[PDB]
Amino acid sequence: MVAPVLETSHVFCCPNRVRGVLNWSSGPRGLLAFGTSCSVVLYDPLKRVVVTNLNGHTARVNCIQWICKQDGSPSTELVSGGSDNQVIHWEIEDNQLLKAVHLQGHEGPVYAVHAVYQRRTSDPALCTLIVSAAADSAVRLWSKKGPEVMCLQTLNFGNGFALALCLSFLPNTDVPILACGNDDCRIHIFAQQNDQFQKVLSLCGHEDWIRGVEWAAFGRDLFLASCSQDCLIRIWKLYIKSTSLETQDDDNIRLKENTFTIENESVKIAFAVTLETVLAGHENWVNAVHWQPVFYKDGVLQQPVRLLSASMDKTMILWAPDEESGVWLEQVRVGEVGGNTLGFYDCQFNEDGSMIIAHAFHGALHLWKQNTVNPREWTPEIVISGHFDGVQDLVWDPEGEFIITVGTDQTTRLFAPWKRKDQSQVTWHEIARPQIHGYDLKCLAMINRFQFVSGADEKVLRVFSAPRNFVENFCAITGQSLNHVLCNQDSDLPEGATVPALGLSNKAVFFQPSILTEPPTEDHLLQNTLWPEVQKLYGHGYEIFCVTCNSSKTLLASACKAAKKEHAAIILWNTTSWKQVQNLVFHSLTVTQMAFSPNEKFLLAVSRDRTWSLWKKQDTISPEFEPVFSLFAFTNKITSVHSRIIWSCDWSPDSKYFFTGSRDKKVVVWGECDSTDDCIEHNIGPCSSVLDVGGAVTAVSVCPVLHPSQRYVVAVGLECGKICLYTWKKTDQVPEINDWTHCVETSQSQSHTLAIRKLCWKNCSGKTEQKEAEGAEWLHFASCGEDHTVKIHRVNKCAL
């Protein structure tokens, strides 16, 4: 009551396009961790929901690695590296963040990270050893004793680089050992005698770059698995050399051993390394390789011997050894060979090996589960998905059951909830991708429940409608009735869409009839889920920049980039027979946003020239004709209060005032636009006091709910991805104080990381009054930004 309760409900995102950005924990009920833009996202595949975001990075995240315990409990600490020259050590408690420590001292983006716990009997506070490698031709080592960190050593590789790292301990002792793969096609081994790391051995054999190494402990011996761009996988073996005796079988042929000696407690110990095998079977590069983690069944630890590899030729291979002979054999080969789509970057196991996950070139995630009875059959499952570049616009269903987003990745996506009988929580998944275009998309607007308008980096607006199988799939997944969702008003219509032979368009296929009861996977979404094109509008001289629509569903606006006055002109269209209606020439720069008052008697525009204008519709009866618009108020340089570019504007729900937000860190209210009957000329002017939010404002939105206490709540977004809810109140007195009150603000884990481009409340006009609601305790809205992310937020009603 005293404070509002803002909480997040759903997040949609996909991993970055980097090697080693995905990692699965070990132990029962582990968590998946990946990196999106500047955040580390934790994901729970069993519930298929995102639990939290960890954000303290200022650039792109590159590597993530959990820290493995010895008891078998789920891990609680991890280490991340960013393209901002810094490493971060996190701590987790109760699926939350407890503490984060920044490690600094690099001069380039970091690209490899590893860390282990130390074993010793002084009862320390869990001492940790960390190794990192970056783009400044150096490798750094760190130690973390409690809340204190210190840099033990740095290693310089001249003008080379290190591409992979791994840490472990020598067998039957407690001396840490390090393996580094380099661009020299050669692996380097370091051992920590005394207090520093010293080179002991160098392993040759590869003849291309190395893209992953991994240690493993088997009995009293140590194994090393190495992959490269040679399309080959090699396994080595490290063991303790004999006691300098009991060696008399000279009647055998054996490979020469690579030997080194170490000092331990005034004792000399000799170790030997020798190659084991050389696998093959891949065509393109091999991007990753991983052993199988150990796990506990009914107390006893089981230690399987298996290997996983993912390659650039759209394939994954699982390897196991043969006991009858001395060779390894392929067991399962999974993937989709064919098409212009490229291969995989990363692959991960489960706790016990039931599930396998892989990360694709664009950012798609693929998950496979093994059958219980049939042990050589795997089936794909449902995973999170989202844009792989900045989202630019957002809209709501007129009745509120799905959202549509566009982004600079040249795609359009639709998200809708899934209803299942044997559970209570509801989860939202992608079900439709009704565009794969050849230009960057910029704007979108909604015309009917299954029809929209899109505008991209070209001089043409396009109109898309929905095919038939989409309605059946929608009503099946969302749990509605097919007859009632049609409302006997759509009737006959095309069945699907397909890519044209030449050019960019959509063609009706009156693709394949495929009924669905569960959300699809990232192979049915890419092909069988397009929408036909039914219109194409010309009349602009440059690339589109803004689009809006009125509440009566019959009109449409547009704008384009311009540098003079003859190009920056608004254009009005029709929605029953698309022709230009009238041209509104004003302003000299680009129009950034427009808005229709809910009264359907106004249109407002804001522009880069720090000005604005209001256009009033004249009244005629003339039923066969169409009304017209003309200037009602305007603003020059002097009357303008915003000192810089205006980015957003919005209307009050009663068509009385309107709010503007600009880069001048100020949100202003201009009011008294009512009394349309007969004013002398106008009375439009500033009706409040300017507010200094703290940063540039790039989004403004007003809730479409009226309260008797006359509350006007405004959702303000900033460049830094903050979302602030204020509460504006008309003073009604000649002082303008006590009109700006701060209501609630987003937390550090609920916020974004880059600019916010849109905010839109759920204007459920179809449900004018909430029939089946808990007294409307909550209000929902949605947000998108340039951090590849789309979020849905919920706020308590009575608090505001």
């Binding site: 396009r17 983006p109 003008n159 291309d208 212009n340 490229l342 050019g503």
Partner: protein
Amino acid sequence: SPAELMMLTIGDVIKQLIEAHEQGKDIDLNKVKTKTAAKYGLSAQPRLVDIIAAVPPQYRKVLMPKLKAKPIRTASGIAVVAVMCKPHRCPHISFTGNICVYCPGGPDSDFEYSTQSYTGYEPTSMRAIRARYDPFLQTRHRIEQLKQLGHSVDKVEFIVMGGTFMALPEEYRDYFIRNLHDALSGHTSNNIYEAVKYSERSLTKCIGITIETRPDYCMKRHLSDMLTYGCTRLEIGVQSVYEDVARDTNRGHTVKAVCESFHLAKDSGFKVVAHMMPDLPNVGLERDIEQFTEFFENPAFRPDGLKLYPTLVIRGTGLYELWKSGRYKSYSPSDLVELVARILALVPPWTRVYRVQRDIPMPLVSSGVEHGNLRELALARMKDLGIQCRDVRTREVGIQEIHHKVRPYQVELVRRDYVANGGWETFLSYEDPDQDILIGLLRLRKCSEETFRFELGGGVSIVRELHVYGSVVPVSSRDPTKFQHQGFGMLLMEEAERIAREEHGSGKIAVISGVGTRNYYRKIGYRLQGPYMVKMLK
């Protein structure tokens, strides 16, 4: 069904080939193909690509020198990959109101989703359209095709086509160049410099990049920007040496600007290739000969490469309207062949001709050239008239080996000096005099008094190109039946280092290079400074 019969035929063919290799005898492929196709009852013959695409791995490695297809694709010593930019408008649309009077296609045209000066039906255009103009996908796709043919892709060179590339926003150019370098190397970088470092340490060498630009977009700023990218070649469209033609076609600049841009680019260290167009309006049959004679005799014009593009009239252009109104008429085919023969007889021995005509599909042309092999018809006519062509392309070992059947016997060393663009140019070469066969070449220039780069001021001589022809020899390998890795490069550099010290009088020598070449010159004894590889000569 024919499919399994085809598969069995292919398998039998490789079986016979590998057997013959095992016991080590030579085998004729065509007879085996016909005989094996006879057995299984077919009505067609196997294709080379199918036979290549079914060899076991070790045998795939061993027996490619017998199943290679289209040996011309790597007969010059490198592998060429062509990529295209995003559609955009030419920069001079604003302050003139329109574009050149003969250029087809573009953002505002009836050729849908096509780049300026192209139609979209071309081979490279249809490759980037289905890839939606993404450099990574285009590079990967082209390298896959080249490997499927059976060629070696150790050494690569890019060609960036489209409109004016250097007129785009900086972010897009950053994106494009870093993606090209990443596609070659395999890294995932953030900006140009990181990508350049990793490509320097790569194993698939990037020899150089080529960019097409306008004379008004070739200044100190643009030259420095292209120097940071790794570019080493430039393509400029001169089209004419007459001042009235350059303004009646709404070109947008003047010839003097072209000459000044040539001077700056050559002093900076680039290589210059010029586009020229015969049969322009208001140019008869006698002004063309004078045009080209002045081109190759006047020091202000002498380029390093040429592209001959006879004028074509295409729908939707101003020249089309001129042609309909009965005011413009093309040459007769015999006259065109005669003119091309006469032009080709004038090219100096230090100039290379890359292409001889455009590649627009025949049905789209309203008038002009109609055949598709103008170069060989012109060569036959030249043989009839008694004159000979002596450019660089038609004198190198690979071309002389595939068109004729000759091999060098009495190699000698040749040097040619001249003056061009206000500078003293030298051209060193190794070639066979009696049979007129070229092997390797090097270009050297003494920097003039109007150089602006910091690294080249104070007495520096710059090397602009080093090249050895033949077939491609992979790095660190040797082939005694080819010409590359046999020591013709360190012989050409030792002589360049003697001219620059005893004759030019300089005290430093600089080289513009790619990245694999960076490692090569580091091997020779050069160090790195800025974007150049430099060495002290004192």
